[PDB]
Design a protein around this nucleic acid. Sequence first.
DNA 1: TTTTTTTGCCCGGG
DNA 2: CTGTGAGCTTAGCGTTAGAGTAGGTTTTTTTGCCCG
Lengths: 787, 787
Amino acid sequence: KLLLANWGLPKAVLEKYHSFGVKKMFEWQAECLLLGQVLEGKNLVYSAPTSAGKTLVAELLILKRVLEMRKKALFILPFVSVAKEKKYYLQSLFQEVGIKVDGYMGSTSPSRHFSSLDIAVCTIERANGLINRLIEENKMDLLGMVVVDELHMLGDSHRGYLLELLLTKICYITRKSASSNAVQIVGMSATLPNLELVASWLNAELYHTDFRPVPLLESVKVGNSIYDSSMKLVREFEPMLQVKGDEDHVVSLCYETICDNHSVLLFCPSKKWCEKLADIIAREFYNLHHQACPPVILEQKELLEVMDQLRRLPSGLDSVLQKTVPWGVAFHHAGLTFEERDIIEGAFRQGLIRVLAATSTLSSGVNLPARRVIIRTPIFGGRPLDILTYKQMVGRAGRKGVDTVGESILICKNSEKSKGIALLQGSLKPVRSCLQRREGEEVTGSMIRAILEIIVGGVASTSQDMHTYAACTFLAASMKVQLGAIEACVMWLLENEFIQSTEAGKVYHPTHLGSATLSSSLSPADTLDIFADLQRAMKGFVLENDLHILYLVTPMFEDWTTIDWYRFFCLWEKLPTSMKRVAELVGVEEGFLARCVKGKVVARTERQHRQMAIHKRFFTSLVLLDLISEVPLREINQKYGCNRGQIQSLQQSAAVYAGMITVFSNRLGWHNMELLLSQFQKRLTFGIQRELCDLVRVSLLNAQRARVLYASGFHTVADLARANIVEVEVILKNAVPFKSARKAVDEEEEAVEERRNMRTIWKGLTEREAAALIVEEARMILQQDLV
Amino acid sequence: KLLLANWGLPKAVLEKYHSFGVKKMFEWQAECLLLGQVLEGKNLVYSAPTSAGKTLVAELLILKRVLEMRKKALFILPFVSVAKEKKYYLQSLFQEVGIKVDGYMGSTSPSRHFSSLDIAVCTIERANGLINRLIEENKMDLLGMVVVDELHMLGDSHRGYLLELLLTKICYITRKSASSNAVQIVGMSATLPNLELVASWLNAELYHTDFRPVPLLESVKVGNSIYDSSMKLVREFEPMLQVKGDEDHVVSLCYETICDNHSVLLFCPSKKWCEKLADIIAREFYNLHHQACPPVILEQKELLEVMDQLRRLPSGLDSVLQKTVPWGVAFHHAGLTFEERDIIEGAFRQGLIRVLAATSTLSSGVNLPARRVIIRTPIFGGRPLDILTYKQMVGRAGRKGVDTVGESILICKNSEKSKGIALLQGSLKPVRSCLQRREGEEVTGSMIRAILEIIVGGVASTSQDMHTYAACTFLAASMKVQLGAIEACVMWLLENEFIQSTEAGKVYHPTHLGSATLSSSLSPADTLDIFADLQRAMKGFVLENDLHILYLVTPMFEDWTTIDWYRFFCLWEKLPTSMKRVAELVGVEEGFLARCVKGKVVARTERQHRQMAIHKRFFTSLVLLDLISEVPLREINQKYGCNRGQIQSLQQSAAVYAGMITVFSNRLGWHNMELLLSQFQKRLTFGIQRELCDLVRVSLLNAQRARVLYASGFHTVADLARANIVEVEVILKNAVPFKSARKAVDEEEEAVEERRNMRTIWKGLTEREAAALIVEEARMILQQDLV
DNA sequence: TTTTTTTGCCCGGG
DNA sequence: CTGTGAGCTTAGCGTTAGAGTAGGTTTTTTTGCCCG
């Protein structure tokens, strides 16, 4: 029977599914669950269209196996948003059963240690981290099920190949003893050409379907000609709205369906192009009630509440959104602050917004269905669009039940027509393993990390064991020089001190730099950079300011932003000698800054790669310093060029890097440097104690200045209006870390002015004056708060 | 009544007195207790000769006050040795009544906060510290008494002026409390002139006596004749055993009384001459028996134990004590290690040694009575002997029940004879406070400190309060320049940031540098060096090795040794680059050391008052680095020119500086420096753990290189003989902090070469060899253990 | 011409 | 590498910036102390 009640679920879960509004399974879900050995614990891989109840199968398999066996089930997800979504959803299903559901994702982590959980939801990197901890604890016996979503990610060399490493380690360490299935794996994937090879690699039952609740019409617009997937001409397009300077009539493609109250989604090659088209479409829709075609109903009093909520936010209401949002038009790209993204997505999900320009950010990691998807070009970023990304984009078409059909138009030039058709009539590439070397190529970083994670984990200490591991990879399954690739990795790992060549055959063991890389879950290519910095700090370290810790803690990135090397070069030359000293030690150099402004950005070498890495890391330190130096965000945007979305990506990554490089120092045994880093980690907590934000009402208090007046005397502004101006001066003067206003002998006055300046306040005032002004400000606040 | 039982003592203490001493008070003690107001709680000064029953009156006054008034006393003593002796004495005397006697002295401190104690036996430097902490905590009401010994010290510029400050602060705060006593001061002093002035300052009763249980027959020897103190000729000398070996015939003056079974104590100017002269005297007892008045009774049944009790010491039986001690002849000076002195204290107190040459270490701080004192010259060092020393050296002449009269003989040439007569017929100079400026002299550092302590404790806030305080000093009594001294100090503090100026006249407050100077109880004149070294080391701190953090905790002294600049230069040229960097980053300079080789003495200025005082502190850090490197002391003493008695005082002193400067860096707010110092503090500890001490001897293992074995679990030589060489190799390779062998880019070859040296044991071994030898040496020692 | 002795601070395990 | 729109704000016109995404340990509220 398709009715889910007939499957004998525990009634709490059945009632929750009924409350979630799903009561019957789809036929493909019954056929998948009835595969004979799957319910017996055989591994499974199934590919079905996204949304469409795809996860319902994996949820029922988890539910049974965690009830049939007390072992823990691990749910691995590609992104923190979908991880958090699935965590709270699974909690609402299972918590009434008494199942403990928590997860590892972002800076979120379980309230109590992994022993307490029954189901863990986590990101790929949190999953591969947890497995290394279960191996080191030798508590791998705890792991009873491992559910992998988006199993096609194995080919993504940047991240996602860790999904191959993770499953290879689970298979190897189990089959090392198993030679009734101990760790049932479930994969969820795409309609890959070689999906059955992945199923054979996992020794899994294979199921695949094409069923989707709302059928999807692919199409191309070529001039005015609209072609279906079979290239039958469905229409010659007529623009209902004539637009200045528009050759593609995207505004007519929007308006044609808006006439029936159906929302539109418009994928654009870039942030700028999203804002341009959200502006244009808003300016055309603004004309309608002046010039008028059927009427458009906007429920503008709801958009007033939406747009007010953007005004409430400390970001403020964006100057483009002022123009577009009143008319139900928005744009949505990663340069927005995360609360702005949630407001815009929420207003779309309620149907208040009706047209939404977006970059790829609504293709991956956000689920928002719309009746009509529009893709602005077949070329993205000066390259042809990836077929995987295209097929994710179009899958946004159609709300379940609300739409009878989902529509997608690829917009294309007649000059592009072949490149257009190639996306519809092409198909996904075969999945392949990033462990595979090209014949002429160095052994890949994915293999090097793969070998490191066993040796340093206390597993497979000999090359006989490593080959017995290596033959378990999907590289091996794909193949049925590779026999030499393991011995090339250990040659590389030895030459970079990650492992010890214990002898008398040979046996390999972790160095500290091994256990550090593993315990921090850094890439071996990152710890070559982080270590060569951290070792250079040990030679000579600046304690007097924060910059020389931020340089060690600041996240590694490649092109976190475009860097204007001239505004960096000038901003370096402006640095105080207090902090210009840090630049001297860190290795920022006039010769490289001058070449970065004057030349083309210089090519890499063994030396010049780290030289570049220092500068790119140092520039990111200044931005992170300005964030802790309490520069208002609106200034930093001008000062460096990084938008307010990138700044949150840096605030998130920097805090985590403090924890990682504390632990990296512990495993190295550098317990002095580790204690500096562990105490600095207390200061990268950017979260405002909003209880202090009362004192923040007076302009003269930074968060520390408020907290020290919150600490000393528990000043409310109502009490700061009552304070003795000299007592405020005393409480300020004795809150700061002491810096001598005297020159010391054999200093230079540059340094002495900076110690004085570091105690002046706004550089322009001294406490003997400012302590009066702040009491005057407090009574000027109080007399207004009373009215 | 002289019978102690009539005074109403608690019987436990009375019977303890019967056990320890005698049932009757001396005739003078019943006078001093019956100065009519003393028993009512009036302050008291008294003087009695050379500890002949001196302290019994003070101890009885403590017992009365602490039992009946029930407030907490503070007993202030000039040395830790005297303080240690008195602590056990006052414990064993009072503890049966439950008086919670403990004390603050050296590294020793009570197991609980002050509020638990009833008597705090205390050194001077730690009594001032404790008074400050009472003032800062506003606990000064807890103090019920202070009792003071050697109150004639107030005139010393180097120490003991603290005893003026301490009593001034007690008087000042008492008067501010009063403006039957809140505190009773009992002061014990030499028979000074102007002692009535000291008594008048404290508003105290006065007692003086010349009473002795054993009279002193002072004399001087000149030209083979003896003269009385009254310059009566006693006799022409009767030289026996007369020999050319030393024409002053010291050997005759010693042996002449040895015939009576009574001991000789022979003070000499210097260790080199003292130790030499005990060897000469031992050769004469050799010359007697090897040619045998009677030959000296050697009692070798005990000397052959005591002399082997020295062989058991980590430095063996001293290479000169080997020659002299078989005869009952010894020497005792502060160039011997502390245990050698404590043993020789026993061997003289039991009378097994009969001739003991000494420096002034037996003059003050330890009480070894002997029948005849001999003083080899009126000159000591480059100057005439201080009469306060002479009248203490000759004070050693009598032991209450063992002999009937004490003797002393100063030895003089026929020339310069009057230099001795001025010692015989002289008397002590009147004591004058070191606060006293000369009219043309820049105000003295002991005044500057006195002004600081009252500001930072906050009991004197204004210029009026500091003129009111100054009227409580002993300077004020001595002057009946004071008007210009107080303001000139408040200027000098301001111009060095110890204090701050505010309005509502001017009112003064401590900086953090004030509270750091006071809480470390450093001298203000020292804090200007210590802070300058910290400030220059918040820059450019070398975390790679301890030498920099040693330099910040190295004790600073005036000529802690004479420094051989050529040997220091030969060390500085030869340090590892990782340490030669630390030399540069504290200002050690090749051209300066070249100058100090070219000439030791120069005109100076505050730049040169740093330069010649940076290097002297760094040379002392080199010695501390060798101690914590576990270098053999036989090498150290050869390497630097230090000697083994100093080294043990440096070990104790450096363990103090690391704990003061942690409080210094705490109260400056330099918390990122505090948590480095507070971590290195734990490693300045040269003892051995409860269970390691037997293991660390064997297989040539350094303390932690042994401890890392025991850190795996309890292990013994029998276990180290069983362990697999490869298991120990991994255990050793897991012990060290990581130090990469790779050369970094932008690094010198010499800078990595040290990291590949720092890994080696010592003949330099890697663990592949040493982890075998450690087991082979263990099993071969086990083959000597089992037999 | 080389050359005497002395002293400071904090808190642990439970 | 390959590619294009709208790019700057000069004045009406030329030619350039450009997607989104992830890691770590430790893990809650309060005065006073006593013993090796």
